[PDB]
Each structure stands twice: as C-alpha cells, then as structure tokens.
Design a protein around this ligand. Sequence first.
Ligand SMILES: CCCCSC[C@H]1CN(Cc2c[nH]c3c(N)ncnc23)C[C@@H]1O
Ligand SMILES: CCCCSC[C@H]1CN(Cc2c[nH]c3c(N)ncnc23)C[C@@H]1O
Lengths: 230, 230
Amino acid sequence: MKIGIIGAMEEEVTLLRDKIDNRQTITLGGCEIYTGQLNGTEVALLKSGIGKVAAALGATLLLEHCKPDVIINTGSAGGLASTLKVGDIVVSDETRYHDADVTAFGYEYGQLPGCPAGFKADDKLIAAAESCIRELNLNAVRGLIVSGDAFINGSVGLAKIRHNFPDAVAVEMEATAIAHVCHNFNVPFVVVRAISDVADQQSHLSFDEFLAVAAKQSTLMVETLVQKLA
Amino acid sequence: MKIGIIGAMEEEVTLLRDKIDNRQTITLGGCEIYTGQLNGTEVALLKSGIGKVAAALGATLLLEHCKPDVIINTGSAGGLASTLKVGDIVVSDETRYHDADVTAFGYEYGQLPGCPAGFKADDKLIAAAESCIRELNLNAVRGLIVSGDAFINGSVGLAKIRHNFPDAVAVEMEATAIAHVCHNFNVPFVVVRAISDVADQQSHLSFDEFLAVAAKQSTLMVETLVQKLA
Ligand SMILES: CCCCSC[C@H]1CN(Cc2c[nH]c3c(N)ncnc23)C[C@@H]1O
Ligand SMILES: CCCCSC[C@H]1CN(Cc2c[nH]c3c(N)ncnc23)C[C@@H]1O
C-alpha cells in the first residue's frame, strides 16, 4: 500500500511533509517528491508546481518513479457552491477542464479529443473520504471540480464557468490534469481539497489570508484518509 | 546524438514513423513512442495526443524513457502572421501559453507562477531549421508561437490572442507544454510546424482540408533538420 499525494504549492505540502518519518527526497524535473512513512503508511508526496502542465509533469514523474497504488490531490480550491465557506472540504466525484474548447469538431465543451468529457474519481476513494469527513465532522461538498490555467476572481471568468458548468462545486488549476494522467495509467484518483476563497470577492486577497487554513484542513483530511486506506 | 520528435496526431507522425529503420514501438499512458534510425540517425518519435496535458505527459515519458538530446515539436498550426500561407513553415523563437491567467497575483498575462513568461527555443536548433528552410526554398516565419487548450476558429478566441499577443505568428495546442517540460529538464527545444489554417471562422474546414499538406511540409522539414543536426 503506497499512497501518492500531490499538491501544487509549498504551502499546501509543508504540513504533510513534516510528518513523514524516514523522509527521503527526490528533486527531479523541477518538482520534488518526499518518500517515507506517514503514521506507518508508505507515501509519496509530490510538490508539482502550479497549473496543468506542472501537475501533469509531476504526476507522470510520481507514477513512473514511485508506482503509487492511488493518488490523492490535496491543497486549496476556489469555492463555487453556495454552502461552502473558507476551510470547508471539497471532494471530486468528477473533474473537467473548464478552459478546453475543440467544439468546432463536435466535442463537448471541456472535452479534449481522445479523452472523456470528464474524468470519474474513484468510488472507493470517495467513500473513504466521506467517512473521514463524518469522523472529523467537517463541512464538505462532493461534486464536479473544474480545472484551468486561470486564477478565478469573479467577473466574466467566473460567469463563463458557471454557465458552462452549472454543477461545478469548486475551481482550481491542477486536479483535472492529474486525473487525465491517472486515467491514462488506470490509477485510482480522488481530489480532497479545502476552500481558500470563493473565486470572487477579491479571491486573491482571501487566498493570501486563508491558504494556511485551507492547507491545515486538507492536511487533516489527507492524514485521516491515508490512515483509513491502510 | 539522439533526436526526440513529438507530434500530437496520427496524421502528423505517420510519415516520419514509416521512415524509421529498426523500429520499436513502446505503448504507454495513451501515448506511443517509436524508436529507431531515420536515415542513420537515432530518433525517438512520440505521438502525444492533443492538448497541453497530453503533450506534457508524453514529453515527460519521452524524456524519461529515451533521454533524447534535443526535442523537435512537429505538426500543424493555425497561422497568424501576415506572410503565411497554408503549407508554410513556422519556427519558434519562443513559446507562451495564451490561456494562462494568474494576473491577479501580478504575473504577466500567459505566465504561470514559477515559470518565465515565455520559453526561449534553442538558438542552435533555430539556426539549423532556418538553414533547412533556405536549402529547401520554403516560405517560413520565425517568432512567437502560442499554445492553449482550444482550437481557434475566429470569434473571441482569435480576437483575444491578437489582442494579448500581437506578435504571435501561429497558434497551436501542445508546443508551450512541451517547452515547459523541456525547460524543467534543461533539454533544447524547437517547434517546426506547418500551417493548416489561419485560425478564423473557416479554420475547422481548412484544417480538415489541409492537415495532410501541413503534415507533409513539416515532415520534409523535420527529416531535413534531423540530418543537418546529425
Ligand atoms: C500566489 C501564487 C499564485 C497562486 S495560483 C493559485 C493556486 C491555488 N490553487 C487552487 C485555487 C484556489 N483558489 C482558486 C481560484 N480562485 N481559482 C483557481 N484556482 C484556485 C490553484 C493554484 O495552484
Ligand atoms: C481531432 C480533431 C481535433 C484537432 S484539434 C487541433 C490539433 C492540431 N494542432 C495544431 C493546430 C492547427 N490549427 C490550429 C488552430 N486553429 N488552433 C489551435 N491549434 C491548431 C493542435 C491540435 O493537436
């Protein structure tokens, strides 16, 4: 049982990194992987960097060099569903690209040729995460998470996403790329992130302020989830 | 010296593929690599699939599994510069994402955090490509190539690119993702593509019509360039 964990930013991986025993590091392809035991569980924790390509590169390296059994994508996210507040958890049942458009060839908006329109997250991983949410008594929303190479702060950027993906519960910049890579190698995948902002209302300022809260909450979730899978 | 070559589509790699001696096929992650010799020179040719993540995944696997010394990204492109006809060659001086936006945190438009705002293509590769262009007496333009996860077909997409990157000579969907991976592994990189359309309201029709011409012209250039580098 080796669990892969991927976060984009230093701030998102630092708490999980500090809790790894017999921690060794691989710096490769401009990313970092940290290997060891987390509460006596073998894990590979990747710091990918930001955006779709960084995440895809990182995910590929992780899968190649660490051969994890599953991948959990952790970190912050912009909340779209109205029940969500800063700190709350979001769990993917599906990921889609909100910025992909080959509709001129009759693909569905969001869909890239050779891909499904959206990528289904693993039902066992989702079940596990929902049990972790009940144990910890966290507030959480399960739903479609959308990814793009844009930081969303209201206006037409947010309106476009709500028009094209009315059911999207959160927006971010890596999850669908990781899902795409995992799909291609048939590795079970799930996103377990926490809200740093509401993708509007000066989200850049909320992000500066509440990223630490979001890192702490997703970290709590991930630790518990990893324990529960082992 | 082993030369890596990356194309997105079957129609873009098929002619080069058929020229490889001692050909082996590695099928992995929804991507296919063909290794062997092209007129005596060691090559590895990737069929990546379409879009940024597909290209990032494939370039990553290509670099890891084959360790090429340079990467040439080939195939078709939507022409933006004035002096470009269907069939003409475009050569990258630089690549940027046209769909990346983290301007809320002070980055330049198209720049992702932790990356340069554009990726400089290798000067020795560019020089060789240009020598080949002259040798074969082709019409070519060297300059900024922009990538995104969208097939550009006039309207907002084209308008947005011409506004944000008035100096861009062509648009496509993989090159910058490949440059990004190459940047992270310090591998020299160039784009040598051919025009299939001009990214306007009739681009989908022109692409269907002229993909084969663009594939042939890029293939001729890449075959020539491979021997020049050899
Ligand atoms: C300070 C340097 C720049 C930060 S770019 C934002 C980080 C946080 N990630 C998740 C994320 C939270 N809120 C979001 C929003 N409103 N839009 C889109 N993504 C998000 C995506 C990306 O890795
Ligand atoms: C299966 C049908 C879907 C094909 S999607 C377009 C292909 C061709 N590639 C280059 C390309 C030529 N013209 C373009 C344009 N107008 N916009 C953006 N990219 C291009 C990108 C991608 O690999």
